[model samples]
Target: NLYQFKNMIQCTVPSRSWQDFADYGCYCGKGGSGTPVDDLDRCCQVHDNCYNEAENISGCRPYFKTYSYECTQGTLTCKGDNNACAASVCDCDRLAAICFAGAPYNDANYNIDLKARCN
Candidate 1:
């Protein structure tokens, strides 16, 4: 997802960025109820033998429910007008990390081409 840094910017912390993934959703089990908005319940909910215990015993499978939503694609820029600029991506884990440790990054860009359907 994370492509390349373009003009002039640097990354102080080493991290990976990703794209093509924005909002993700899934259902909860055990002491938990309803569908979780994130992948937090991908594993066990309360006890190891929660609602999907059979599936867990079968293969320790993650919460089967999965989903994602895309955003309007384009170039976004953050200038020296510093304070604290925040943007929300569909899925945090889906974004790619741009670096590892302290490094300089600029003009970072990426693309997302996704498709979804039901059967």
Candidate 2:
């Protein structure tokens, strides 16, 4: 999942870091959910399509889902530290600013294809 980094005790992970990816579906915040847990959790499952307007704590599209790797490889320091520190909020915070601004979550999936091209 993560290489390492508590910051000072050996502040690792960001030294141009990224690994074979802590397996079991494109990881980070491996608490519990779906999309078979792969490919950055598929944008937290296609951002749940909260079309009619949406906080489910902003279900935090893996806090910003990614196409960064082939199918599952996203990580922030402290290894998903509470999964991007939990929705950094709305009916799922409207996909958290389309993967970041909504919940304002900070990780690096960049954006899940504009969330299925929007509702």
TM-scores of all candidate predictions against the true structure: 0.15, 0.18
Q: Cα deviation in Å at residue 119, candidate 1?
A: 27
The digit string of per-residue lDDT tens for model 2 on 1-119 reads 01111111122223322221222233222323333233444433443333212223354343343212111133222223333323221223233113321222234433333323222
The residue-by-residue lDDT of candidate 1 on 31-109, one tens digit each, is 3343333333332122223323323333322233222323223222333332211111112212221111122322221
Provide the lDDT at 104 for model 1: 30
Residue 103, model 1: lDDT of: 24
On lDDT, the leading prediction is 2
Please give the CA lDDT of all the candidate structures.
Answer: 0.24, 0.28
